[PDB]
Design a protein around this motif. Structure first.
Motif, PDB file in Angstrom:
ATOM      1  N   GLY A   4       1.409  -1.313   0.155  1.00  0.00           N
ATOM      2  CA  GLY A   4       0.126   0.274  -0.021  1.00  0.00           C
ATOM      3  C   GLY A   4       1.264   1.870  -0.034  1.00  0.00           C
ATOM      4  N   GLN A   5       0.104   2.263  -0.305  1.00  0.00           N
ATOM      5  CA  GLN A   5       0.820   3.249  -0.281  1.00  0.00           C
ATOM      6  C   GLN A   5       0.158   4.459  -0.909  1.00  0.00           C
ATOM      7  N   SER A   6       0.134   5.519   0.667  1.00  0.00           N
ATOM      8  CA  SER A   6      -1.201   6.462   0.874  1.00  0.00           C
ATOM      9  C   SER A   6      -0.056   8.257   0.429  1.00  0.00           C
ATOM     10  N   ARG A   7      -1.230   8.796   0.334  1.00  0.00           N
ATOM     11  CA  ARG A   7      -1.238  10.328   0.898  1.00  0.00           C
ATOM     12  C   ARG A   7      -1.768  11.224   1.107  1.00  0.00           C
ATOM     13  N   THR A  49       4.431  11.004  -0.341  1.00  0.00           N
ATOM     14  CA  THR A  49       3.963   9.385  -0.342  1.00  0.00           C
ATOM     15  C   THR A  49       4.350   8.518   1.138  1.00  0.00           C
ATOM     16  N   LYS A  52       2.725   1.852   3.571  1.00  0.00           N
ATOM     17  CA  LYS A  52       2.098   0.935   4.847  1.00  0.00           C
ATOM     18  C   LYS A  52       3.423   0.436   5.097  1.00  0.00           C
ATOM     19  N   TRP A  57       1.789   3.619   8.517  1.00  0.00           N
ATOM     20  CA  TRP A  57       1.997   4.278   7.820  1.00  0.00           C
ATOM     21  C   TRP A  57       3.223   4.939   7.812  1.00  0.00           C
ATOM     22  N   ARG A  89      -6.596  10.912   3.351  1.00  0.00           N
ATOM     23  CA  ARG A  89      -5.763  10.182   2.934  1.00  0.00           C
ATOM     24  C   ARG A  89      -5.927   9.446   1.799  1.00  0.00           C
ATOM     25  N   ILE A  91      -5.633   6.316  -1.042  1.00  0.00           N
ATOM     26  CA  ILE A  91      -4.921   5.418  -0.300  1.00  0.00           C
ATOM     27  C   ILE A  91      -4.626   4.164  -2.027  1.00  0.00           C
ATOM     28  N   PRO A  93      -3.321   0.489  -2.787  1.00  0.00           N
ATOM     29  CA  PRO A  93      -3.357  -0.862  -2.703  1.00  0.00           C
ATOM     30  C   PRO A  93      -2.400  -1.318  -3.452  1.00  0.00           C
ATOM     31  N   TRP A 123      -8.748   2.221  -5.674  1.00  0.00           N
ATOM     32  CA  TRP A 123      -8.284   3.358  -5.027  1.00  0.00           C
ATOM     33  C   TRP A 123      -8.631   3.824  -4.082  1.00  0.00           C
ATOM     34  N   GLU A 126      -9.553   8.018   3.385  1.00  0.00           N
ATOM     35  CA  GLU A 126     -10.180   8.167   4.060  1.00  0.00           C
ATOM     36  C   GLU A 126     -10.424   9.203   5.115  1.00  0.00           C
TER      37      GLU A 126
END
Ligand code: HG
Ligand code: HG
Ligand code: HG
Length: 139
Positions: A4-7, A49, A52, A57, A89, A91, A93, A123, A126
């Motif tokens: 996972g990556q998020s921003r 970025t 996960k 995070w 956020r 996200i 996966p 995607w 949240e």
């Protein structure tokens, strides 16, 4: 585990949900793409970025912050969830594709814009709490 990556981004403005004509994707098969139910938002990235990291995070990658996030197809499911003035956020996966939230279909009205990003169907978004926001800023 690291799947996972998020921003985080501040949601500044949300465009109407409506059918729009889409650009001919530069270098793909030429077709007259039909109008598609769609919306987009103006966001401002609040940090880089984050990978996960188990149940959490990792640290934001070092950090222009404007972005147009483009929603069509099943991503229209986010429309009524998203409100200007809130921080979300975003996200993605799966494996951490290095430059995922840098850039990539595009609404005709955004032809040649500098920072468009298409929201993929898997995607998610949240809503961030006040403490969530501060923790990213502080790192
Ligand atoms: Hg607008
Ligand atoms: Hg890790
Ligand atoms: Hg843009």
């Amino acid at each position: 585990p690291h799947l996972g990556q998020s921003r985080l981004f501040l949601l500044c403005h949300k465009e109407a949900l409506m059918k729009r004509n889409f650009c001919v994707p530069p270098g793909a098969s030429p077709e007259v793409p039909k109008p598609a139910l769609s919306f987009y938002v103006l966001g401002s990235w609040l940090g880089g970025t984050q990978r996960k990291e188990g149940t959490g995070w990792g640290l934001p990658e070092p950090q222009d912050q404007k972005v147009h996030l483009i929603f069509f197809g099943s991503s229209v499911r986010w429309f009524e969830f998203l409100h200007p003035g809130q921080v979300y956020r975003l996200i993605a996966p799966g494996p951490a594709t290095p430059m995922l939230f840098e850039k990539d279909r595009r609404p005709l009205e955004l032809a040649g814009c500098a920072s468009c990003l298409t929201v993929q169907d898997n995607w998610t978004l949240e809503l961030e709490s006040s403490q969530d926001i501060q923790d990213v800023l502080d790192a």
